[PDB]
Design an enzyme around this catalytic site. Structure first.
Site, PDB file in Angstrom:
ATOM      1  N   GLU A   6     -32.585  46.618  35.810  1.00 62.02           N
ATOM      2  CA  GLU A   6     -32.602  46.481  37.427  1.00 62.02           C
ATOM      3  C   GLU A   6     -31.326  45.311  37.021  1.00 62.02           C
ATOM      4  O   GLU A   6     -31.277  44.611  36.182  1.00 62.02           O
ATOM      5  CB  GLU A   6     -33.842  45.882  37.851  1.00 62.02           C
ATOM      6  CG  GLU A   6     -34.204  44.532  37.366  1.00 62.02           C
ATOM      7  CD  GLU A   6     -35.137  43.750  38.310  1.00 62.02           C
ATOM      8  OE1 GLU A   6     -34.855  43.699  39.476  1.00 62.02           O
ATOM      9  OE2 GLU A   6     -36.345  43.657  37.709  1.00 62.02           O
TER      10      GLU A   6
ATOM     11  N   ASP B 185     -35.798  35.753  21.323  1.00 65.85           N
ATOM     12  CA  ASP B 185     -34.235  35.408  21.321  1.00 65.85           C
ATOM     13  C   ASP B 185     -34.198  34.733  22.962  1.00 65.85           C
ATOM     14  O   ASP B 185     -32.997  34.839  23.441  1.00 65.85           O
ATOM     15  CB  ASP B 185     -33.214  36.495  21.351  1.00 65.85           C
ATOM     16  CG  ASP B 185     -33.390  36.598  19.739  1.00 65.85           C
ATOM     17  OD1 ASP B 185     -32.489  36.195  18.893  1.00 65.85           O
ATOM     18  OD2 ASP B 185     -33.920  37.858  19.510  1.00 65.85           O
TER      19      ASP B 185
ATOM     20  N   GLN C 171     -28.875  32.519  28.912  1.00 61.79           N
ATOM     21  CA  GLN C 171     -28.097  33.616  29.220  1.00 61.79           C
ATOM     22  C   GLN C 171     -29.063  34.786  29.544  1.00 61.79           C
ATOM     23  O   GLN C 171     -28.455  35.748  30.413  1.00 61.79           O
ATOM     24  CB  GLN C 171     -27.061  34.039  28.123  1.00 61.79           C
ATOM     25  CG  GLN C 171     -26.137  33.053  27.717  1.00 61.79           C
ATOM     26  CD  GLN C 171     -26.723  31.954  26.758  1.00 61.79           C
ATOM     27  OE1 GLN C 171     -27.682  31.116  26.819  1.00 61.79           O
ATOM     28  NE2 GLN C 171     -25.968  31.927  25.461  1.00 61.79           N
TER      29      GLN C 171
ATOM     30  N   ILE D 107     -20.160  42.277  31.835  1.00 63.33           N
ATOM     31  CA  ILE D 107     -20.472  40.848  32.373  1.00 63.33           C
ATOM     32  C   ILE D 107     -21.113  39.691  31.276  1.00 63.33           C
ATOM     33  O   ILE D 107     -21.037  38.621  31.709  1.00 63.33           O
ATOM     34  CB  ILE D 107     -21.644  41.061  33.528  1.00 63.33           C
ATOM     35  CG1 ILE D 107     -22.926  41.761  32.944  1.00 63.33           C
ATOM     36  CG2 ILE D 107     -21.164  41.672  34.658  1.00 63.33           C
ATOM     37  CD1 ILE D 107     -23.928  42.070  33.953  1.00 63.33           C
ATOM     38  N   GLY D 108     -21.086  40.249  30.247  1.00 62.30           N
ATOM     39  CA  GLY D 108     -21.692  39.462  29.086  1.00 62.30           C
ATOM     40  C   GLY D 108     -21.993  39.887  27.829  1.00 62.30           C
ATOM     41  O   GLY D 108     -21.916  41.168  27.622  1.00 62.30           O
TER      42      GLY D 108
ATOM     43  N   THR E  73     -27.050  39.080  21.687  1.00 64.54           N
ATOM     44  CA  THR E  73     -27.222  38.963  20.098  1.00 64.54           C
ATOM     45  C   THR E  73     -27.408  40.450  19.925  1.00 64.54           C
ATOM     46  O   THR E  73     -26.780  41.104  18.899  1.00 64.54           O
ATOM     47  CB  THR E  73     -28.649  38.429  20.009  1.00 64.54           C
ATOM     48  OG1 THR E  73     -28.454  36.761  20.338  1.00 64.54           O
ATOM     49  CG2 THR E  73     -28.932  38.574  18.589  1.00 64.54           C
TER      50      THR E  73
END
Ligand SMILES: Nc1nc(N)nc(-c2ccccc2O)n1
Length: 294
Positions: free
Chosen positions: A77, A123, A127, A10-11, A14
């Site tokens: 989760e 960070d 996102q 899903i993504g 870093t």
């Protein structure tokens, strides 16, 4: 892992790629983050493992820290959408102010919680802020930088996001403080309001100079000690500061005042998450339901 019937990637973050996965046995849907090799720091494993004890409505729950087959996976989760995607989806009309306010308030509560427990994010970016249909927003990936350190390049080669990095980091300060998270959140707040990244730097120096062109080149008056920072150069151009009324229009003065305190150059002057929660901007805060298209 055969424990899951993997839903999909899903993504990418870093510190590693994130996947949506379903436990074949329990049926539980979770987010699985695969951390990227040599010997896997033992110091970090215990440190990250301690994060399983963090419990707050605005922090994504770390369910498990899997260390098997000499690989490190974090089990979180699952929430259905990240703030970056929501902002993109809301770009035409903009996120209503009451929702922006609710999200900021919640994010500050989550940061206040982590910071009081001596946990830093380092960070923060749209996102890794996740939202659900109930109007909640939560921070994910807290404490990873302090535990592992910091990469520089991903195995898949992904342009690292510098847009939310505090100036003291960009100037080479070796000892970060909770203030870096307040800075990142300030940048995100501005972006939700204007629907455009506040400081979209293309390089580390462009990031720094974009900050300087907007907030003015820092000096010893506003930031004592700045001229002695590791990467500070007397040759930096000296730009005059702009007005916030031009920075985040059409945000009202309560919002501009709060943002200005979140963006102070001096980490020591930058407002804390706890103090920010008391700002007048939140006098009328509510918890609206977002229009989420899943
Ligand atoms: N890109 C991304 N998209 C969704 N829907 N969730 C996540 C996520 C990332 C870390 C922890 C929990 C999560 O739901 N990350």
């Amino acid at each position: 892992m055969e424990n899951f019937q993997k839903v999909e990637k899903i993504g990418e973050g870093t510190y590693g790629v994130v996947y949506k996965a379903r436990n074949k046995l329990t049926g539980e849907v979770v987010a699985l983050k695969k951390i990227r090799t040599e010997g896997v720091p033992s110091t970090a494993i215990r440190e990250i493992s301690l994060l399983k004890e963090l419990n707050h409505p605005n922090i994504v729950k770390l369910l498990d820290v899997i260390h098997t087959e000499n690989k490190l996976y974090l089990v979180f989760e699952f929430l259905h959408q990240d703030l970056k995607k929501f902002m993109d989806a809301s770009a035409l009309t903009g996120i209503p102010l009451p929702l922006i306010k609710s999200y900021l308030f919640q994010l500050l509560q989550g940061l206040a919680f982590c910071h009081s427990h001596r946990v830093l994010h380092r960070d923060l970016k749209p996102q890794n802020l996740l939202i659900n249909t109930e109007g909640a927003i939560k921070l994910a990936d807290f404490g990873l930088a302090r535990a592992f350190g910091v990469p520089v390049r991903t195995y898949t080669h992904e342009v690292v996001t510098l847009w939310y990095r505090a100036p003291e980091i960009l100037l080479g300060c070796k000892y970060y403080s909770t203030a870096v998270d307040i800075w990142s959140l300030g940048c995100i707040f501005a972006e939700m309001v204007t629907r455009r990244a506040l400081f979209p730097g293309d390089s580390e120096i462009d990031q720094l100079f974009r900050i300087f062109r907007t907030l003015g080149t820092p000096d010893e008056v506003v930031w004592p000690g700045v001229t002695s920072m590791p990467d500070y150069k007397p040759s930096f151009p000296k730009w005059a500061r702009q007005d916030f009324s031009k920075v985040v229009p059409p945000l009202d003065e309560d919002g501009r005042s709060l943002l200005s305190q979140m963006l102070h150059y001096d980490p020591n002057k930058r407002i804390s998450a706890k103090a920010a929660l008391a700002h007048p901007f939140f006098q009328d805060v509510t918890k609206p339901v977002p229009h989420l298209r899943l």
